[PDB]
From Swiss-Prot, chain A:
Organism: Escherichia virus Qbeta
Subunit structure: Interacts with host MurA; this interaction inhibits the first step in host cell wall synthesis. Interacts with the capsid protein.
Biological role stated in the UniProt entry: Induces host cell lysis. Inhibits host MurA activity thereby blocking the synthesis of murein precursors necessary for the host cell wall biosynthesis. May be responsible for the attachment to the host pilus. Makes extensive contacts with the viral genome.
Similarity comment text for this entry: Belongs to the Leviviricetes maturation protein family.
Region RNA-binding, annotated ranges: 1-18
Native organism taxonomy: Viruses, Riboviria, Orthornavirae, Lenarviricota, Leviviricetes
Entry protein name: Maturation protein A2
Signal peptide (residue range): none
UniProt subcellular location: Virion
UniProtKB/Swiss-Prot annotation, chains B, C, D, E, F, G, H:
Domain of life: Viruses
Outcome when changing residue 33 to S: In strain: Qbeta_3_FR
Lineage: Viruses, Riboviria, Orthornavirae, Lenarviricota, Leviviricetes
The protein, known as: Capsid protein
Entry's localization field: Virion
Family: Belongs to the Leviviricetes capsid protein family.
Originating species: Escherichia virus Qbeta (Bacteriophage Q-beta)
Length: 52, 132, 132, 132, 132, 132, 132, 132
RNA sequence: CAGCCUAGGUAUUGAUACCGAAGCUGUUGCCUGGGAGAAGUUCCUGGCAGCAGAGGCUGAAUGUGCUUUAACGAACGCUCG
């Protein structure tokens, strides 16, 4: 079940990627840092998903 | 973002081996690049990962990391699947104060290069001998 | 060229079918005449376009176009509409000089008709056989 | 379709001229076969082209092209060279889908041929009369 | 090596059907002749390609190639156009030295034929069974 | 498809010779059954190989490979046993999918078998004449 | 220019030999027709090739290449079939421009012919005598 | 290979005209003999050059070259001095081996001659008809 | 270098829409695979990048990048009649 949950969160991130958005794509990014991460500049879709 | 091909030369003791490293991507988390040899095999492809950091909160100095893998690719391994037997780790780490200079960085850079090229470090890295 | 219902005979592989194309009038914007074969389904009707452009500025490029279309539908199981699933197009384009004359213009027509009947284009298009 | 001397008779207004086109071979680049009228000056030879391209990707769109070129020069006073001052061009293009059948294909050709023989294009291009 | 219609009889598991492959256009792009089912649609379905690459820098050593392809297609209960569900194909090759002799070339031909007729290959092919 | 003495009867130009390949064995390292004609000199014998590759995870396609090799004698006027001078190769690779069918498998077999005998391939291999 | 059996009459030093080039084919990759003398061993036949290159956009001049090669057998007293030893090359290259003329080209033709016959080239080729 | 007057008879389409070629100076920079129309000015128009390149580090392997140049000129109606509007030319290149033999060289010579005399070359040159 | 275009490629229900490379051709090297004769090598099959084989029209540099490199009105050379 935990694997299924992980895959669901990944699917959410990918769907965000497909629809296209840089800020809304961070829905999952905020689910790991355990902190209020702030931006620094203008990122990119695949950049904020390949290893983000 | 590093997307440059590096055509290395003077590899090995004989100095007659040459290598080429082609970029493979960038890791948009820690400011890391990636470069590899031309091929399609982990053992035959040598890894070069450079990384550059900036101060955020945990530290107040830069960090230039460099990790090179030179796996030993064996030919005869029971089939046409060259595997790895000896993994060659080469880890380099730097730390520069935010008030340092390009001059100072180049100074350490060239001193490192010259020591590596001289017969000083060759005896300790290849033949494995202590400072008599 | 007065438009009228055109009767084309001795057509097809064996040259026994016939086509009765009735005028569709002329587009006022495109300035192009159109004919179509009588049928129950307007969408399933073999159509025939003809255009005769006038000479433009400074080049005059006497131009003629002829666009023949032929559809073929196949009503799917459960569908109450014979959707056009197949379409054949053929567009001929003649280009003449402002000093061209009836003589060679008729010559070219007869040439094209003769080749279109000749064995070469015959197997070139019936069987889609490249000519070599 | 093997290339061979193509002899078409009964052409012109009166349908009494004849053209003998010899094979010019095939471009290895465009993959297009070419035929020419036998004459003294190759610049003054009636040329005809036949092309039949292969299936493309994901639409596959079978296509065939025939290009008819007829030149005519006019030796100027003092000029020792029958410079080509006139050129007639006719481009025919057939488009079939990969589901096409020789039945419909030959139907297309015969329709085109009879249309080119009908009074319709007769007045349309022999005299440049836009059809209406 | 003239191109024409080939009617191969005594075909299949019990050797009763027959296939008639009519010629196509010899591919300029690579100089390879083509034969296909009598048609109509099967003309663009079934294929038999034959090529003979002459001695070259890569080729030394004439190389003869024969590629046969048979696409199995079906119509869903409600569809119209047949879609290919499966694709058969085989590829025969003969590589022959510049000093080869025609007698031995035909020996090779007939040997391959008699083996394909031998029960061993029909078992290993038609039934897909390793010889054991 | 168990191994055993294969006797090809009539083969060759005039169709008069016969071949007797005796059963060698099966290399298990690659699952390859082999057959050789009766002799002593490994380098001077007509050989044939049959192999049956099942759909691998990275392939998912059934394969049958059949090879034939025939070396030339060119026996010298003394001075030792003959020397291999020329080597005629033939290779066939048939390929299907998992839901393949016995019938169309045998169909492709017989199609190629009769192609090998038809006059086209006859002079295509025989006289090396490009299909034309 | 239909390919056919070329029957070349008296030739040689005294002019008593006759040659028979049977038509092989026409490589489409470069549009070159080839003739070869009747034989078996492709390595040991006298052959000729003719190409007619049309005026490209890059050259715009008609080209006619005629290549001729004659091998020498030098058969050895046993031990294998003969080996190619000597290889006589000849290549003629006619060039004309688009407004060239048939009379001009035939003039050049017969001019080269009769110079080939004339005593000069006789001794220049036969004797390898320097024109002098 | 003595240089002197050559009377080249039965020339051109009908084989009726004659060409009288008188000798020139042999270019010492390259050792090439030359022949020209009998004159007057056509001596500076028509040319027939002859070369016998001897073995070398590149040549081994004699090369005999024969180049023919014929410029067609005309006089504009009002000018005086004719200008060359056209230029035909051809070149023959025999590559003979050191151990070549005059028998073989003459045989190749006459082969070229009579092929040039043959229907194939006449229509491949005069009419520029590719062999199809 | 920049732009303009097209001749072609394209698709399209015809009409209309993208690009100018297209496209294929061959060749240089990188070249793995899969299969395997069994090879002192020949065969089956495959990809990557580069080169040469579409075209012209207009303007900019005459060593290269760019930021005050400018605008107005007369005279001069200097083309014409």
């Amino acid at each position: 079940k935990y694997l299924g949950l992980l895959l669901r969160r990944l699917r959410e991130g990918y769907r965000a990627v497909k629809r296209g958005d840089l800020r809304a794509l961070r829905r999952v990014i905020q689910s790991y840092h355990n902190g209020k991460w702030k931006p620094a500049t203008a990122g990119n879709l695949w950049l904020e998903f390949r290893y983000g | 973002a590093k997307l440059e091909t590096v055509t290395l030369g003077n590899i090995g003791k004989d100095g007659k081996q040459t290598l080429v490293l082609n970029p493979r991507g960038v890791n948009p988390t820690n400011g890391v690049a990636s470069l590899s040899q031309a091929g399609a095999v982990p053992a035959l492809e040598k890894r070069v990962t450079v990384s550059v950091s900036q101060p955020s909160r945990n530290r107040k100095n830069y960090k230039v990391q460099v990790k090179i893998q030179n796996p030993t690719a064996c030919t005869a391994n029971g089939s046409c699947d060259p595997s790895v037997t000896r993994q060659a780790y080469a880890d380099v780490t730097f730390s520069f104060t935010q008030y340092s200079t390009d001059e100072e960085r180049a100074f350490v850079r060239t001193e490192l290069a010259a020591l590596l090229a001289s017969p000083l470090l060759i005896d300790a890295i290849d033949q494995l001998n202590p400072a008599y």
